[PDB]
């Protein structure tokens, strides 16, 4: 089915995940329907480490897409508002 | 990735002092300088069309100690940026770190200014940085770390920098060993012996 997961971009030991909406049978970086926000596990104390378009994420939950477990924790970390 | 050779032989090919050997004695006080640059250098050259643009470019590289692979990369950013590409090159060569340290008087030579930078003795914006190519951002502070406090060069060079012109786009604090980087340097405010227009024409060949 459709899923909301992560795409390990970045460099050697400097990862960067782009939250994408893709079919579950893909190659993690390949064919995706729509990328929605990102995530930076090595982010600074700066203003931006995680952006999520929650309107679109909640739009895909209604369509039946399943959220990955690392992605599900980011909804808890953002606390749905801030 | 450095020159590592006779310093003022580079000035002899140009015929002018490039300040890269300067302490107190002007120009050897003796034999030959600002003259014959080799064995057959007593014979005057003819200075062809390529060579006039070449020796103009080589002079600027011998000043700041930048190699050709690196200097051409400054030209890429200088040409892509707005404004006068001939002016932005001397802007980016000015913002280079070892130049900034040399303009403070913290080191008495652009080579010596690299010696202080490379041996992690200078904290720009509070953070120790050993990159000689560090492009210094505007409205920033440069400072000497405590391990280089009065370590026999900082005192000797800063007192030597009293015969300088004390560059207007900077604020050095001789007695607190901390510098302050003011605005971007204006084109007319630097050395002005350099025909910057001969450089841009060379790489645009």
């Amino acid at each position: 089915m459709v899923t909301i997961r992560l795409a390990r971009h970045g460099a050697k030991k400097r990862p960067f995940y782009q939250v994408v909406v893709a079919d579950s049978r893909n190659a993690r970086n390949g064919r995706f329907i729509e990328r929605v926000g990102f995530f930076n596990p090595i982010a600074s104390e700066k203003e931006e480490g995680t952006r999520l378009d929650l309107d679109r994420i909640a739009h895909w939950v209604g369509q039946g897409a399943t959220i990955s477990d690392r992605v599900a924790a980011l909804i808890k970390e953002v606390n749905k508002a801030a | 990735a450095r020159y590592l050779g006779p310093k003022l032989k580079l000035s002899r090919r140009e015929g002018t002092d490039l300040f890269l050997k300067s302490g107190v004695r002007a120009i050897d006080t003796k034999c030959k300088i600002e003259q014959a640059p080799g064995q057959h250098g007593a014979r005057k050259p003819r200075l062809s069309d390529y060579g006039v643009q070449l020796r103009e470019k080589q002079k600027v590289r011998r000043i700041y100690g930048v190699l050709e692979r690196q200097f051409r990369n400054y030209y890429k950013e200088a040409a892509r940026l707005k404004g006068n590409t001939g002016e932005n090159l001397l802007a980016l060569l000015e913002g280079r770190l070892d130049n900034v340290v040399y303009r403070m008087g913290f080191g008495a030579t652009r080579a010596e200014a690299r010696q202080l930078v490379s041996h992690k003795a200078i904290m720009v914006n509070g953070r120790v940085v050993n990159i000689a190519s560090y492009q210094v951002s505007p409205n920033d502070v440069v400072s000497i770390r405590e391990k280089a406090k009065k370590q026999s060069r900082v005192k000797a060079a800063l007192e030597l920098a009293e015969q300088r012109e004390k560059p207007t786009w900077l604020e050095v604090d001789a007695g607190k060993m901390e510098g302050t980087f003011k605005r971007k340097p204006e084109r007319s405010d630097l050395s002005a012996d350099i025909n910057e227009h001969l450089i841009v024409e060379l790489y645009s060949k």
Binding site: - | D49, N84, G86, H197, V200, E201, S204
Partner: protein, 157 residues
């Protein structure tokens, strides 16, 4: 100051009944540095005797050309004897980017930013006659508005 400049020097021949006598042509361009130029062409039996001779004719053909603080007003073409010289104003094009024998004219003209390309032949004598014809054929905004329209700011925009 008048900025003398040497461009090319050859060795032409004559073929008299005994042997051949070599004259040395010398093509020089002079120019003040403010849109005034001039090229001298002269030959003599000696090399330095001709460059002095080409200085003399250079000051006789002084031509005034308008320029916009160091560059052209508008792009212009410069056809003369198989030389299809093209010039671009290059508003801060940063450099006199032009070939041999087309550079030296625009230097002493007092021009600093041009883009140019010598199409066709690259004969030094004709490419100098190309730009000298090419620069004097260029107008000025006040010179065009003096002809028609009668307002320099109204015609331009």
């Amino acid at each position: 100051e008048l900025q003398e400049k040497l461009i090319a020097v050859n060795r032409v021949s004559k073929t008299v009944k005994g042997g051949r006598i070599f004259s040395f042509t010398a093509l020089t361009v002079v120019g003040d540095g403010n849109g005034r130029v001039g090229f001298g062409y002269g030959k003599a039996r000696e090399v330095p005797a001709a460059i002095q001779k080409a200085m003399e004719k250079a000051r006789r053909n002084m031509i005034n050309v308008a320029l916009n603080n160091g560059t052209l007003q508008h792009p212009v073409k410069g056809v003369h004897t198989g030389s299809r010289v093209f010039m671009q104003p290059a508003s801060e094009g940063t450099g006199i980017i032009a070939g041999g024998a087309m550079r030296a004219v625009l230097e002493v003209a007092g021009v600093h930013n041009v883009l140019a390309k010598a199409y066709g032949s690259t004969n030094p004598i004709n490419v100098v006659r190309a730009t000298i014809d090419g620069l004097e054929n260029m107008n000025s905004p006040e010179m065009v508005a003096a002809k028609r329209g009668k307002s320099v700011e109204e015609i331009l925009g």
